[PDB]
Amino acid sequence: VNEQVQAWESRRPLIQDLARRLLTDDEVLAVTRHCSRYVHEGGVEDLVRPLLAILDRPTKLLLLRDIRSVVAPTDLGRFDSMVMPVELEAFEALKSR
Ligand SMILES: C[C@H](CO)OC[C@@H](C)OC[C@H](C)OC[C@@H](C)O
């Protein structure tokens, strides 16, 4: 928790600032709550699943960059198993336009 909580507290201003430029305030509050819950209680699938439902456009996926920095080392493989296919689909969405 502690290193991840420290990483979150140091990156929260960037994450929240970018989130508010891309999402509604209610969605920013949801992202904030999911990130805080994860760093304090763990469970990386419970962080990613709701984020992928909120971050529903390629530009919104930019938020996952700084969020990955708060993911505990033992959770990174799962995070990437879930997010990497979504990054590729988003590139396809930008390309097919
Ligand atoms: C979607 C967004 C940009 O497409 O990147 C996703 C997110 C998981 O960041 C990837 C990772 C943190 O950085 C990869 C770079 C540093 O090579």
Numbering used by the authors: 547 to 643
Paper text:
PDZ domain-containing 7 (PDZD7) is part of the ankle-link complex, playing a vital role in the development of cochlear hair cells. The long isoform of PDZD7, which is indispensable for hair cell development, contains tandem PDZ domains (PDZ1-2), an HHD (harmonin homology domain), a PR (proline-rich) region, and a third PDZ domain (PDZ3). The PDZ domains are responsible for interacting with USH2 proteins to form the ankle-link complex. Interestingly, three hearing loss-related proteins (Harmonin, Whirlin, and PDZD7) contain this HHD, but the molecular mechanism of these HHDs is largely unknown.
We then determined the HHD structure at 1.49-Å resolution. The HHD adopts a canonical five-helix fold (α1–α5). In the structure, α1–α5 are aligned anti-parallel to one another, making a five-helix bundle with multiple hydrophobic interactions inside the bundle. The experimental MW of wild-type (WT) PDZD7 (12.1 kDa) matches its theoretical MW of 11.4 kDa, confirming that the PDZD7 HHD is monomeric in solution. Taking these results together, hydrophobic interactions inside the five-helix bundle are important for the folding of the PDZD7 HHD. A unique feature of the PDZD7 HHD structure is that the α1N helix turns back and contacts with the pocket formed between α1, α2, and α4. Val547, Val616, and Trp554 from α1N form extensive hydrophobic interactions with Val577, Cys581, and Val585 from α2, and Ile613 and Val616 from α4. Interestingly, this hydrophobic cleft between α1 and α2 is a common site in HHDs, such as in Harmonin and CCM2, and is required to recognize an isolated amphipathic helix on their binding targets. Structural superimposition of the three structures of PDZD7, harmonin, and CCM2 shows that the PDZD7 HHD is well-aligned onto Harmonin and CCM2, and the α1/α2 cleft of the PDZD7 HHD domain is occupied by α1N and is not available for canonical target recognition. However, the α1/α2 angle in the PDZD7 HHD structure is 25.3°, suggesting that it adopts a more compact conformation.
